[PDB]
Design a protein around this ligand. Structure first.
Ligand code: HEM
Ligand SMILES: O=C(Nc1ccncc1)[C@@H](NS(=O)(=O)c1cccc2nsnc12)c1ccccc1
Length: 419
């Protein structure tokens, strides 16, 4: 029997705690057991790995050893990048941001979750599907997509179809998205530049009838946008929050942006090049607030890690939330220190197996370049156009960890004023 963390005396073991304070649970696993420890998620044992040694095993393991295929049961009901194009995407993102703030005026107040959740729906759809498709979208799409993400309660590890309100809303939201897509398809029929939707609409089945239904197309689009939406949305929100919490960093970023853009080149040029201060703020934001706090796998065989035996069928997990703060690897792990990424320390590069907001090894984030470029493009526009201030106590900004998809809790109010 592998070492088991304390508690977990509820009906589904540690499931209830996982649904309320997953980070505290995972930290207790490490504090009590070390690099290899377990907790019970309903009828499934989760082997939580942490530390460089254990993480190296996790990230260097291929599909034949650790598989992600059936590690996330909450996604089944929901589903149903090249540098060459990066310059174009940067310009697209700049355009989407300018469109989102077009009605801001001289001063006002926004809720970060509402703002960035909607903005990232537009940037994601425009870049991945096409500008033509994004132009046929409005706030409704973002609202429905949010419901999908809110439908990821860990109870899915018991059963993804339990009769609970969040799952009911998840299913209703997906039907709503199918209807929006169907409306767009019908709109193109009556009122005819092409995008991915046009490509799918054109395919015919072995009978002359359209191959893909609105439902199938919607599932494809939902899946294409799922990796980058909540992650980019949360990262943008927390980047702004930490800049406001640390005015010295904010000031340094502003001076840097004003100096860099002084060469007269566009955001599509600069968002693909170094913006030092902002990049380090982003790295530190990701270390402290990793959008994915836990990564899951299903063991396909028997492996030994530090004397601990892992058997086939076992759920195996790594945690950016916990690993990103190991005190031995990151001096003063709970403090916001962008300087830890400067050439002298480079703590992100030095800790290859523990600085994992973007994963590592064979599972390196393929969208990281795009995500970093997006943050650079977004803030190149926002910070040069407006000044931001917190509208609530600095310590009151927090994440909601009740669903597998972590999202900012409300309120998250910020005030702006033209520069
Ligand atoms: C700030 C935003 C993002 C964060 C923090 C993030 C984080 C991660 C993490 C932690 C991993 C490793 C997951 C694992 O080991 O199971 C990863 C892998 C990956 N990410 Fe992202 N990601 C982000 C945005 C994106 C975007 C925009 C895309 C889509 C274009 C994307 C596509 C992928 C893919 C395909 C993998 C490879 C998975 C594998 O090989 O197992 N990511 N990402
Ligand atoms: O893995 C998830 N999301 C994600 C986002 C960005 N980068 C990497 C992963 C997501 N599970 S998923 O939707 O099945 C999924 C999407 C894309 C690539 C994947 N590789 S493995 N699973 C993938 C998720 C959301 C919330 C908590 C954990 C996992």
């Amino acid at each position: 029997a592998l070492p088991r963390v304390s508690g977990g005396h509820d009906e589904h073991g540690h499931l209830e705690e996982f649904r309320t304070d997953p980070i505290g649970l995972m930290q207790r696993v490490r504090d009590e057991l070390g690099d290899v420890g377990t907790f019970q998620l309903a009828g499934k044992q989760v082997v939580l790995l942490s530390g460089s040694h254990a993480n190296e095993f996790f990230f260097r393991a291929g599909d034949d050893d650790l598989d992600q295929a059936k590690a996330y049961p909450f996604m089944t009901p929901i589903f149903g990048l090249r540098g060459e194009q990066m310059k174009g995407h940067a310009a697209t993102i700049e355009d989407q941001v300018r469109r989102m703030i077009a009605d801001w005026g001289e001063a006002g107040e926004i809720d970060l979750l509402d703002f960035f959740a909607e903005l990232t729906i537009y940037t994601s759809s425009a870049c991945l599907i096409g500008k033509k498709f994004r132009d046929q979208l409005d706030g409704r799409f973002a609202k429905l997509y949010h419901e999908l993400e809110r439908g990821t309660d860990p109870l899915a590890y018991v059963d993804p179809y339990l009769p609970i309100e969040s799952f009911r809303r998840r299913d209703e939201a997906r039907n709503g998205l199918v209807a929006l897509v169907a409306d767009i398809m019908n709109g193109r029929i009556a009122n005819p530049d092409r995008d991915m939707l046009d490509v799918l609409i054109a395919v015919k089945a072995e009978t002359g009838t359209p191959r893909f239904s609105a439902d199938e197309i919607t599932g494809m689009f939902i899946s294409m946008m799922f990796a980058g939406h909540h992650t980019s949305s949360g990262t943008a929100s927390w980047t702004l929050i930490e800049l406001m919490r640390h005015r010295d960093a904010y000031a340094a970023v502003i001076d840097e942006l004003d100096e860099l853009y002084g060469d007269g080149r566009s955001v599509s040029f600069h968002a693909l090049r170094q913006i030092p201060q902002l990049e380090n703020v982003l790295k530190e934001t990701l270390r402290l607030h990793p959008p994915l706090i836990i990564l899951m796998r299903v063991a396909k065989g028997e492996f030994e890690v530090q004397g601990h035996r892992i058997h086939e069928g076992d759920l195996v997990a790594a945690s950016p939330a916990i690993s990103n703060r190991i005190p031995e690897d990151f001096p003063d792990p709970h403090d916001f220190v962008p300087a830890r990424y400067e050439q002298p320390r480079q703590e992100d590069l030095l800790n290859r197996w523990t600085w994992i907001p973007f994963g590592a090894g064979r599972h390196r984030c393929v969208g990281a370049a795009f995500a970093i470029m997006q943050i650079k493009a977004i803030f190149s526009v926002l910070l040069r156009e407006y000044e931001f201030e917190m509208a609530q106590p600095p310590e009151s900004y927090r994440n909601d960890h009740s669903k597998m998809v972590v999202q900012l809790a409300q309120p998250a109010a910020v005030r702006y004023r033209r520069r």
